[PDB]
Amino acid sequence: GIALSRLAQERKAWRKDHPFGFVAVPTKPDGTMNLMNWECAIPGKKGTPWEGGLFKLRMLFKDDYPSSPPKCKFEPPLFHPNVYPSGTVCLSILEEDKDWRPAITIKQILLGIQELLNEPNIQDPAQAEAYTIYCQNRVEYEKRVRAQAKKFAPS
């Protein structure tokens, strides 16, 4: 009831204020909206190995929300140092006992993640492969990022 009330406003705000290319819509018993399960899409930033790719993730809110952050998973999982092999996104703003704030909008989340894509947080890696290649062979790293950007290019 608390989360739903706040999530209803989030969808309201989003509809009238969000970046081009981004997508944040709840899932669907049919016809009825599931405000606790959002299907999202994040375009790669222009002028990066990520540009041209549309990386889709799932945004899972709890009834604990907004006290607690949503859980964000890339589906399929992404090659990236701050994303668990399960697809779970590791972002400081998505952690209760850290940088998360009740005020944080879905917009800020999807943008926060978009910056994370091209600017990994070496401090706390979740993925062993991505982290390694990132720390040693950047050229090959970015070669694997562009190949992925194409795999997830629309159409």
Residue-range domain boundaries for the chain: 1-155
* Residue type at position 72: C
Experimental method: X-ray
d(CA 132, CA 17) in angstroms, rounded, equals 38
N-terminal to C-terminal alpha carbon distance within the chain: 38
d(CA 36, CA 63) in angstroms, rounded, equals 8
Q: Which residues pair with 39 in a beta bridge?
A: 25, 58
List CB contacts of 124: < 8 A, sequence separation 6 or more. 82, 90
What are the φ/ψ torsions at residue 56 (nearest 5 degrees)?
-95, 135
Resolution value in angstroms: 2.7
d(CA 39, CA 86) in angstroms, rounded, equals 16
∠96-123-121 over CA atoms, to 5°?
Answer: 80
Annotated active-site residue 40? The verdict is no
Q: Is 105 exposed, middle or buried (0-12, 13-18, 19+ CB in 10 A)?
A: middle
Q: Which of 40, 72, 90, 135 is catalytic?
A: 90
Q: Which residues pair with 91 in a beta bridge?
A: none
Which residue shows structure tokens 């040693």? 136
Pick the CATH number of 1-155 from 3.40.50.2300, 1.10.150.20, 3.40.800.10, 3.10.110.10: 3.10.110.10
